[model samples]
Target: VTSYTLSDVVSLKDVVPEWVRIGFSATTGAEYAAHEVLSWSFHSELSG
Candidate 1:
């Protein structure tokens, strides 16, 4: 799997013209724990 920082995701937001803005105050324990799995799933599905 590819690796990217939070900064990379934020920077990429600009280039993704159709991206919707979603803000989260903080990540929950479960969410943070699942971040990599979720991110990889999202990127893989969306990138396809």
Candidate 2:
């Protein structure tokens, strides 16, 4: 698979009123590989 969805299943349910934070990590152990984050985009929508 070449694509993924960050649906509600992956979101933080029962959220708090305080500030939120998100983080990510990547690794290739015992091997050689490249890890780069060239771009990132996020958007949220709520409607009636």
Candidate 3:
């Protein structure tokens, strides 16, 4: 028998990603800055 409900899994998915994004924003100043940095690095790796 499954012990978890649909609400529990959905809430976990929502909350955990938001929490991680908050941590990143605190360090990076904003989410856009983090995304920009990630995109730049990703493109650089491909160009290499």
Compute each candidate's TM-score over C-alphas. Answer: 0.17, 0.41, 0.14
Q: Give model 2's TM-score versus the native structure.
A: 0.41
Cα error, residue 29 of model 3, in Å, equals 30
Per-residue lDDT tens digits for candidate 1, residues 1-48, read 998766333566566676565434446664454333334222323563
Q: Decide which is better by TM-score, 1 or 2.
A: 2
Top-down lDDT ranking: 2, 1, 3
- Model 2 residue 38 CA deviation (Å) reads 1.2
Q: Over the stretch 1-48, how does candidate 2's per-residue lDDT look in tens digits?
A: 598767555445555543566667888878968878889988766566
Best by lDDT: 2
Question: What lDDT does candidate 3 reach at residue 15?
Answer: 54
Give the Å error, residue 26, model 3: 23
Q: Of the pair 2 and 3, which is ahead by TM-score?
A: 2
